[PDB]
């Protein structure tokens, strides 16, 4: 059963949805998927970016000028060239649909492109990104179809079939049941070992745990939306079979408890109280004892392991001692709880209802305020309502996320003022217009160890603030047979090495 697909050399990994739209210039494919047939011109790594696709490149200083150098013998899966050309095809295609890709700054600080001859092309920029190369690394949207199969030369609106540079071709399809990924042998680089990697659509929990311990199914990760078909209990079980191994990646974001300097209404507006709270939230416990050794506690808000992230700056210890002065010292003081100018002390915390370990440490710290004179409110809502509430504005308290290790720290640095990101928290904040353009100009520095210290120089003040109490590092968890070798995590939530694994 299980046996049997070692000596195809394959894996049928189970996931709880459809692959969707593989046009890669859209964003309705599965993101695992996409990085199997498609390739960026650079890949990012854990140990920093690399050549790929485009064997090198230079950079202008007034930082505005890629030019990259592009391995010639690389073969689209229809056998269409890949040359410079394309190349530029592709880019335009995807840039004209700006609209839709414009929550990523490069699509926007972009200005035009053009093929210096066969196999070199030049990108140029609005303004300068250092970011860019990460960015352009994602497996969406700057990724490569074949020319043959563009509509009338466009990409958005659809694409005629899914040709691309990749070490895996897309095979037969079924919508809602099974995708099939089939090794490459015209691949140029690290060509699969295994010969077949299947997606196999089904619920998680029970449903999976089956398939997989009978081998109808037997490969698990994380899929793009942090959903893990296995729980806790069941992961054990596999182990427990003996033909399964159990990996897990490092931190892949930050849990976090997001505060409002913004609104003037509640006291969370206030400095102290924010730095109060600050020491209330008992990372450990809350680690171990809810979330049960599965996510590491977060003690900063970018852990070391991403992008230009070179420091440690270890935020506020859980200390009830040091959060009761502080209290005092705002303002807020018969029996134990608060109260300043007659109205006692309440929050509002906001969270998402459909993940249960968020509302298990929501009203953990229900707990922990109520000890200590604070009340919470401790509301529930769908992951849309909290997006909208976010960007709206309208919370005290609310759990949420950093964007990940594609994205970071740009991405999460970014929405420390973007409308739809955390602007509304930063906002309330002493040298906002200083911070917000530290931050501008942060994502503009070359130099790699300047950046660095801008990064770490913008996060002391936030931090400073208390706008963010991290809790813990989400993980991507990946399952596979235990006579499987070289699965590797990537700086990415979404891919794995599926090319460079073996039996």
């Given at each position: 059963g299980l046996e049997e697909k070692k000596e195809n050399k394959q894996l049928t990994y189970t996931t709880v949805k459809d692959i969707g739209?593989?046009?890669?210039?859209?964003?309705?494919?599965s993101m695992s998927a996409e990085s199997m047939i498609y390739e960026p011109l650079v890949r990012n790594t854990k140990d920093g970016i690399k050549p790929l696709l485009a064997k090198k490149w230079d950079v202008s200083e007034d930082g505005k000028t890629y030019t990259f150098h592009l391995r010639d013998d690389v073969k689209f899966h229809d056998g269409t060239p890949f040359d410079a050309d394309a190349v530029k095809k592709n880019i335009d295609a995807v840039q004209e649909n700006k609209k839709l890709h414009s929550w990523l700054k490069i699509s926007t600080l972009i200005d035009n492109v053009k093929v210096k001859d066969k196999y070199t092309v030049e990108l140029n920029l609005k303004e300068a990104y250092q970011p860019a190369l990460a960015e352009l690394a994602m497996?969406?949207?700057?990724v490569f179809v074949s020319p043959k199969d563009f509509k009338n030369g466009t990409t958005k609106d659809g694409v005629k079939k899914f040709d691309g540079t990749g070490p895996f071709k897309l095979g037969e399809h079924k919508k809602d049941e099974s995708a099939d990924f089939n090794k490459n042998?015209?691949?140029?680089?690290?060509?699969?070992?295994?010969?077949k990697v299947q997606a196999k659509v089904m619920p998680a929990g029970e449903t999976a745990f089956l398939s997989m311990k009978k081998g109808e199914t037997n490969f698990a990760f994380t899929d793009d939306r942090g959903t893990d078909s296995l729980d806790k209990d069941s992961l054990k079980q596999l182990k427990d079979t003996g033909d399964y191994q159990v990996k897990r990646s490092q931190p892949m974001n930050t849990k976090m408890l997001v505060v409002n300097s913004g609104k003037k209404d509640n006291a969370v507006s206030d400095k102290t109280v924010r730095q109060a709270i600050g020491h209330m939230v008992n990372r450990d416990k809350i680690a171990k004892e809810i979330l049960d050794g599965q996510e590491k506690p977060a003690t900063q808000l970018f852990a070391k392991n991403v992008t230009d992230i070179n420091f440690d700056m270890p935020t506020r210890k859980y200390d009830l001692k040091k959060a009761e002065s502080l209290l005092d010292e705002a303002g807020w003081k018969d029996s134990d709880v608060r109260q300043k100018d007659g109205k006692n002390l309440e929050m509002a915390m906001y969270y998402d209802k459909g993940s249960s370990s968020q509302k298990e440490q929501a009203e953990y710290l229900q707990a922990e305020f109520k000890k200590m004179g604070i009340k919470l409110n401790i509301n529930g809502e769908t992951s849309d309502k909290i997006a909208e509430r976010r960007t709206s504005g309208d919370y005290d308290l609310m759990f949420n996320q950093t964007w990940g290790l594609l994205y970071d720290p740009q991405s999460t640095i970014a929405a420390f003022k973007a409308k739809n990101g955390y602007e509304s928290a930063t906002s309330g904040i002493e040298n906002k217009d200083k911070i917000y353009n530290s931050i501008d100009d942060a994502f503009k520095i070359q130099n790699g160890k300047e950046r660095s210290d801008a990064y770490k120089n913008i996060l002391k003040q936030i931090d400073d603030e208390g706008i963010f109490i991290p809790i813990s590092h989400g993980s991507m968890t990946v399952v596979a047979p235990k006579d499987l070798e070289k699965v590797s995590f990537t700086q990415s939530q979404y891919e794995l090495p599926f090319n460079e694994m073996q039996y």
């Open positions: 739209d593989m046009n890669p210039h859209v964003y309705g494919g497996p969406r949207p700057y042998d015209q691949y140029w680089g690290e060509k699969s070992k295994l010969n």
